[PDB]
Design a binder for this molecule. Structure first.
Ligand SMILES: CCCCCCCCCCCCCC[C@@H](Br)C(=O)O
Length: 223
């Protein structure tokens, strides 16, 4: 475990954002993107997934939270991997609670596979979270979720899901079908879908402005 890239709070941290990068990345690029929208009282934590073989691309070894097999809803998914990665995320949250920031003052998010992991984590933890930012991603192991609202700790969590309309790796329709399913799993009044014209498998400045607004609305100052 190389230590996560962190954007510290100015001097007094009362909330945290845990953000998981996408395939092949480290946590550093996203931590700098978050510094550009940082709020004084918010700690930003971007852990790094470990290098591992990735079945999708000739087994090439690169950072990935879990193995990626295919690009299709009919593709087999790395169930043991996703769940183990999910357990590791909850341990990272629990450690922040011990550090001093309650779980309901923490937003979990990610990009692509990291956003997939963040959604799955948020929907399976009894750790009540402040919200989720899911960027260009999808809901993994979707068939494992029974009908109806999950109930559970995060039945009311607020979710911001973002997706470029020219993404060639996670087609926009995957994000769209994901948000609509999320709206049957948690309270639909707290789920926001935003799309970005021209954007591919990347980020853009308007999207980062919507994430900042989302984070600041749900994690407002307490001083
Ligand atoms: C309700 C949900 C319906 C659609 C679910 C289908 C999921 C298919 C996703 C394929 C993976 C895309 C790979 C992205 C890589 Br570049 C990464 O980050 O690992």
């Amino acid at each position: 475990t190389p230590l996560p890239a962190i954007v510290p709070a100015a001097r007094k941290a009362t909330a945290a954002v845990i953000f998981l990068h996408g395939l092949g990345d480290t946590g550093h690029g996203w931590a700098e993107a978050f510094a550009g929208i940082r709020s004084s009282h918010i700690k930003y934590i971007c852990p790094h997934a470990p290098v591992r073989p990735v079945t999708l691309n000739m087994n090439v070894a690169m950072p990935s939270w879990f193995d990626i097999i295919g690009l299709s809803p009919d593709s087999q998914e790395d169930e043991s991997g996703i769940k183990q990665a999910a357990e590791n995320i909850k341990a990272l949250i629990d450690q922040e609670v011990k550090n001093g920031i309650p779980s309901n003052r923490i937003i979990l998010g990610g990009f692509s596979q990291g956003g997939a992991l963040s959604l799955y984590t948020a929907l399976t933890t009894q750790q009540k979270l402040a919200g989720v930012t899911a960027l260009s991603c999808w809901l993994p192991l979707r068939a494992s979720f029974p009908q109806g609202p999950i109930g559970g700790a995060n039945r009311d969590i607020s979710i911001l899901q973002c997706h470029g309309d020219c993404d060639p790796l996670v087609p926009l329709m995957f994000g769209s079908l994901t948000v609509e399913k999320l709206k049957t799993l948690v309270n639909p009044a707290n789920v926001t879908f935003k799309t970005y014209e021209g954007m591919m498998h990347s980020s853009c400045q308007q999207e980062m402005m919507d994430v900042k607004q989302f984070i600041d609305k749900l994690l407002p100052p307490i001083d």
